[PDB]
Ligand binder design. Structure first.
Ligand SMILES: Cc1ccc(CNC[C@@H](C)O)s1
Ligand SMILES: Cc1ccc(CNC[C@@H](C)O)s1
Ligand SMILES: [Zn+2]
Ligand SMILES: [Zn+2]
Ligand SMILES: [Zn+2]
Ligand SMILES: [Zn+2]
Lengths: 360, 360
């Protein structure tokens, strides 16, 4: 069986399990079960399943080089699919809640969950909570007797928490740190002194890289009983590198990709986000450019946004991007080589993760 | 040391631990740490700590009848305090998110977290997520080598999930089940056919009783290594009984207690909640009363709310309440006696829980 058809089959299985348990142990009625079914499908399906499929791909890599009974190969692949779905559902949680927090309109060329007429924010906040609860129900059901249960749950929590911390770093990225105060409405930064590479890196490391690259890689290792074929500091380093690069691409596309390809109208400029474009622009701009950026950034006004866009196009950020890219290729290749000392197989999974990130 | 001063001390300890870890492992800066500190205090403190103190009280009960070294007594009490704080922080999560979902104004005579000028919904949704993540960080840190870790985490998740399911039952309680549909804006029920005792009970069982009574009781048992001194079906039954009663009182007070005592302007009528008052009113009203209730319920209009209030006062619901109360006293006393067969001590903790609920 091809990996994707197994992964998709296990979604159906896990969905049936969750909804069946809701009827048999949580007293749910049929119409509410249908609501939850439709919520699950709408929030968890329709992406590329990159994250969850990474778990599967890492596990398949080990299967190719490790002796096992056929029933064991099947069990490991089923565990990798279940684990994959945990990460997809964790993402679904965050996309639901983030869309509500940001007042987003679309995601993947469809309305954000909370905008559906029969959902509303009141229900959608809680739907998002359910989504993350369902990751725990899956783990406890399917991994109840597994030797990796503890490690897997402890890893999952730490990544979830890093993610929520990342979200705080992101939504507060345009405030002056010294002015953060629950008692006082937060003004946008006027100096942009906190739009640095190091600060951008911290946002991205926590908000994105832990759940998108570290967790799929390490969960694949866990469900394969293979954590000892790797130096975990190397896995973290490569994860953080690849994830930062992933984000840099997304930040570029938010500004320059037509809405039809990103599946939304990009608003990073209007939201005054600490994006790779803003940080890199400020790292090369002259005095006058800086002053024009400060008078136009973080404003809904289409004229001011167009001035910000024009500032970025004139500043030749494509050249900064190519240089960033080259350097990432260097460092990622280096880390892949270091990973080969202990696991060729694992190194090749990371290679595949890198090439799917780099090509797109 | 008195129980409450130990419990309060452990809050300070757990807070210091969480914030210190944020600086040492999550790269947090001082001002964001202060924001989180203030968030934690504002959301987790200022109630009666009934839930968390139950954990402590159950543990102290066992300490009085079980032989242990002094260092062991201390460790069990520290575990009970930490476990207590997990449940308080879980509540804090739900109160944050519920207040945002319901557009609430006040809670405990102070503004809801999301209303603070320097918070906003964008940050508050995520603050609420952090609050629940911090329950997991606490458990993994303080209970890492404990034999009850698995059981405690599995119980915690199931209660969290039941709670979120309860929330879905509550916010959808005024819709017709057969009309639930993410695609279609939900109309308020016109027939109120789903305002029954059984349906009310399901909302309350999930939304309230699992986290407020079942989890504190069973966590006390867990941290005491005492789950075998009880029949767990009896613990569940008594929990569900006491919790329903708790909710019935809150539903009565939402309508009739001055805002100064409940710490808010009650809105159950305007929100068209499936409250004990509405269900019990509909269980005794004549045709004309029913028709007047349907023309006035679930409307912001102060005149219509006052008509709903007047309908409840004329219907002598105090007498239905006294009868409900008597019957709960019967059943709770019965369950306490059944609990004595295996643990006098545990039975006496439940007695104390009952008397603190019943007296208030
Ligand atoms: C924690 C997260 C919030 C949003 C995420 C997905 N990244 C693309 C989005 C910003 O459009 S992950
Ligand atoms: C899951 C929960 C939502 C709200 C809760 C606290 N009960 C009083 C409130 C309704 O005013 S628990
Ligand atoms: Zn966001
Ligand atoms: Zn983006
Ligand atoms: Zn509510
Ligand atoms: Zn209430």
């Amino acid at each position: 069986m091809a990996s994707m058809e197994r992964f998709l089959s296990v979604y159906d299985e896990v969905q049936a399990f969750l909804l069946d348990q809701l009827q048999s142990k949580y007293e749910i009625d049929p119409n509410r079960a249908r609501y939850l079914r439709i919520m699950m499908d709408t929030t968890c399906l329709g992406g590329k399943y990159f994250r969850g499929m990474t778990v599967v791909n890492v596990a398949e890599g080990f299967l190719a080089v490790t002796q096992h009974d056929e029933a064991t190969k099947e069990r490991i692949l089923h565990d990798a699919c279940v684990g994959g779905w945990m990460i997809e559902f964790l993402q679904a949680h965050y996309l639901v809640e983030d869309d509500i927090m940001d007042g987003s309109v679309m995601r993947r060329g469809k309305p954000c969950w909370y905008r559906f007429p029969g959902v509303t924010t009141q229900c959608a906040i809680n739907d998002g909570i359910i989504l993350k609860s369902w990751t725990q129900i899956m783990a406890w059901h399917y991994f109840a007797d597994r030797p990796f249960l503890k490690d897997l749950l402890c890893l999952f929590q730490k990544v979830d928490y890093a993610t929520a911390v990342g979200q705080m770093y992101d939504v507060t990225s345009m405030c002056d740190s010294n002015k953060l105060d629950p008692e006082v409405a937060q003004p946008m930064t006027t100096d942009f002194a906190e739009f640095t590479p190091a600060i951008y890196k911290r946002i991205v490391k926590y908000k994105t890289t832990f759940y998108t690259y570290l967790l799929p890689l390490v969960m694949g290792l866990l469900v394969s009983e293979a954590a000892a074929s790797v130096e975990m500091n190397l896995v973290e380093r490569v994860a953080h590198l690849i994830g930062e690069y992933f984000q840099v691409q997304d930040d570029v596309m938010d500004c320059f990709t037509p809405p039809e390809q990103l599946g939304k109208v990009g608003t990073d400029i209007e939201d005054a986000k600490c994006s790779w474009l803003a940080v890199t622009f400020l790292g090369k701009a002259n005095a006058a450019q800086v002053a024009e950026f400060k008078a136009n950034y973080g404003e809904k006004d289409p004229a001011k946004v167009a001035v910000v866009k024009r500032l970025y196009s004139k500043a030749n950020l494509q050249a900064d991007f190519a240089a960033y890219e080259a350097e990432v290729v260097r460092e990622v290749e280096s880390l892949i080589e270091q990973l080969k000392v202990k696991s060729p197989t694992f190194a090749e999974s990371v290679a595949v993760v890198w090439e799917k990130t780099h090509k797109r």
